[PDB]
Write a protein that binds this ligand. Structure first.
Ligand SMILES: Nc1ncnc2c1ncn2[C@@H]1O[C@H](COP(=O)(O)OP(=O)(O)OP(=O)(O)O)[C@@H](O)[C@H]1O
Ligand SMILES: [Mg+2]
Length: 258
């Protein structure tokens, strides 16, 4: 498992532009994508990250993967990362080879396809998981294949960027319980999600809004620290993940800080 820490992190996607402008002539001010971000999770813990559209959630994951350097603060992490990107993707080849890396573990594979609900899908194909991607998959199928790929990989830190985005409420719930909570029980993970139930199960919660930490702490803390926000969303969780994003974004603007 990895430990993960951000201490006072501020970052600007535009920083490079400023550096080139100064180079051509021989710290940047602007709109930070992330501002004064703090969190720590221990080995094996889950951090749920939520927030409004454009808040920096994906950008936060990108900093952990070394794609964006902090202009201020420190990030500490080590080890192997598995990343489930916000848009799904599929490489030419079988369903099974979309899921598995260099090595194959029969049992691990079966338990991944089971927890991501891919069994019923696969059983409707003449060639099962050996069907070649010819035929095209739904957005829901693709996203579940992409999550199985990320979770199958043996890693130290799993970064799951809205993997329930295109799923219904029921499928989202079973997969969250079987995969994220059971199958990955002992793994360090960061899940971008809009479900209040998910934040209730997390070890830590980070809510972002306009780049800033709207909230960091536990679920109990959230209910008292942001009591009107909490009250308005706690029936939000019966809406689709797709739909909960617009509502959550409205709700953060509604109870935005000072
Ligand atoms: N990989 C990237 N490289 C550079 N800029 C990025 C990258 N990903 C997102 N951005 C930009 O960073 C800013 C913050 O948005 P980001 O995508 O981090 O928000 P988000 O909270 O993930 O939103 P959504 O909820 O809409 O997925 C946006 O202007 C976006 O265009
Ligand atoms: Mg999102």
């Amino acid at each position: 498992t990895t430990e993960v820490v951000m201490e006072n992190v501020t970052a600007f996607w535009e920083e490079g532009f400023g550096e080139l402008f100064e180079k051509a002539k021989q710290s940047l001010l602007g709109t930070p994508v992330l501002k004064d971000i703090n969190f720590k999770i221990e080995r094996g813990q889950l951090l749920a990250v939520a927030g409004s559209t454009g808040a920096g959630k994906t950008s936060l994951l990108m900093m952990i993967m070394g794609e964006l350097e902090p202009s201020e603060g420190k990030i500490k992490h080590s080890g192997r990362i598995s990343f489930c990107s916000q848009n799904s993707w599929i490489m030419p080849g079988t369903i099974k080879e979309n899921i598995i890396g260099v090595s194959y573990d029969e049992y691990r594979y079966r338990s991944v396809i089971k927890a991501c609900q891919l069994e019923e899908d696969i059983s409707k194909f003449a060639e099962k998981d050996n069907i070649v991607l010819g035929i095209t998959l739904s957005g829901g199928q693709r996203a579940r294949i992409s999550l199985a790929r990320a979770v199958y990989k043996d890693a130290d830190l799993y970064l799951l960027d809205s993997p329930f985005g295109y799923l219904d409420v029921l499928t989202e719930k079973e997969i969250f319980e079987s995969c994220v909570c059971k199958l990955m029980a002992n793994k360090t993970r960061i899940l971008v999600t809009s479900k209040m139930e998910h934040l209730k199960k997390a070890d830590k919660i980070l809510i972002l809004h306009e780049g800033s930490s709207y909230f960091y702490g536990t679920f109990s803390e959230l209910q008292n620290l942001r009591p009107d926000f909490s009250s308005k969303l706690m029936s939000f969780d019966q809406f689709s993940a797709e739909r909960r994003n617009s509502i959550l974004t409205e709700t953060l603007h509604r109870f935005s800080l000072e």
